[PDB]
């Protein structure tokens, strides 16, 4: 989508504004903040096309400023716009979950010990829902370390830096072990 500068109105396949509307999803979700600052924030393209609709600008600013208050309020419009699309239909389940886990990972990136009050005030949602949410994001989500409710306050550890950076090669190491077992399997026959 970096070629959007030279792109013009096309009546053959898709309109320019429709193309922007389609790529804004992958650009906002699949790309993290450094990628945004490197590409779209530094670029004047989004600055020019934000005047098209007030919605997109708010969606970008709310996510960049990490405000879920207006985000969850306008989330309904995003959901309704997400579905009822030709090629974008089957993926409507994936983008939501991806954006949620990306937002959670982003918020838990700079935060370690989080109280329930400030969280409930930030997201503007009940604690019982984020309870089962995070509970599922532990096993099925696989984002950060174990969370304990004993103190009635969210507290993580996340030793994913020091030993884990060296433990990133243990998977490819085991796969390489199986692969040299394959190499030993080719031997003599």
């Amino acid at each position: 989508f970096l070629d959007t500068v030279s792109t013009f109105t096309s009546y053959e396949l898709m309109d320019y504004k429709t193309f922007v509307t389609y790529t804004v999803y992958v650009s906002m979700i699949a790309l993290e903040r450094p990628d945004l600052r490197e590409k779209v924030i530094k670029g004047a393209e989004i600055l020019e096309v934000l005047h098209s609709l007030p919605a997109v600008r708010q969606y970008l600013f709310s996510l960049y400023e990490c405000r879920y208050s207006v985000f969850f309020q306008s989330l309904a419009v995003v959901e309704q716009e997400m579905k009822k699309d030709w090629l974008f239909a089957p993926h409507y389940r994936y983008y939501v979950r991806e954006m949620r886990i990306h937002a959670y990972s982003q918020l838990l990136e700079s935060y370690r010990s989080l109280t329930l009050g400030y969280m409930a005030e930030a997201f503007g949602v009940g604690v019982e829902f984020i309870d089962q949410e995070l509970s599922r994001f532990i096993a099925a989500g696989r984002l950060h370390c174990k969370i304990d409710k004993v103190n009635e306050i969210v507290e993580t550890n996340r030793p994913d830096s020091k030993n884990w950076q060296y433990q990133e090669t243990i998977k490819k190491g085991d796969l390489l072990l199986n692969r040299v077992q394959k190499l030993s399997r080719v031997i003599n026959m």
Partner: protein, 162 residues
């Protein structure tokens, strides 16, 4: 589930079993008890209902294991309704039965009548590292060394006739 391997065989073979094997993580006794026997054909044609009559009551053990992977504080109402089992005694009893297995980690404490747990799943990182990855290093080095033997002997089998 099946990820890297793509073939039009294992898919069709796992099709009837897919719904239930996906229903394992959910852990609903009442409905799935009837659901299994409903459309069940092949896995009950395996005969003598062994691993399935084990699985039926293994659902609650994998479920309480999911509870062990879950938070510490146990509600008398909420999680009791979520697990579809409500009672003071059998809760802590089955939990203790999950503790004695040794497959998990929990700290049994009684103060106000509620049972908490430390439930730390944290790995061996920065905790007794040497004794931790010792056997891993030894074994992997043994495999890589017999792999060195594997890059040793066959070239000799090449150079035997020349």
């Amino acid at each position: 589930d099946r990820l890297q391997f793509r073939q039009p065989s294992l898919k069709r073979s796992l099709m009837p079993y897919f719904l239930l094997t996906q229903a394992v993580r959910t852990g609903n006794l009442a409905k799935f008890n009837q659901v299994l026997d409903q459309f069940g054909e092949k896995f009950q044609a395996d005969g003598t209902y062994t691993l399935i009559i084990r699985l039926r009551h293994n659902v609650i053990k994998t479920g309480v294991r999911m509870i062990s992977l879950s938070y510490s504080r146990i509600s008398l109402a909420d999680i009791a309704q979520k697990l579809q089992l409500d009672s003071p005694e059998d809760a802590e009893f089955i939990v203790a039965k999950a503790i004695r297995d040794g497959v998990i980690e929990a700290s049994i404490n009684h103060e106000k009548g509620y049972v908490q747990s430390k439930e730390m799943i944290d790995i061996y990182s920065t905790r007794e590292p040497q004794l931790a990855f010792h056997q891993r290093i030894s074994f992997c080095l043994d495999i890589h060394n017999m792999s060195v033997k594997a890059m040793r002997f066959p070239p000799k089998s090449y150079n035997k006739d020349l």
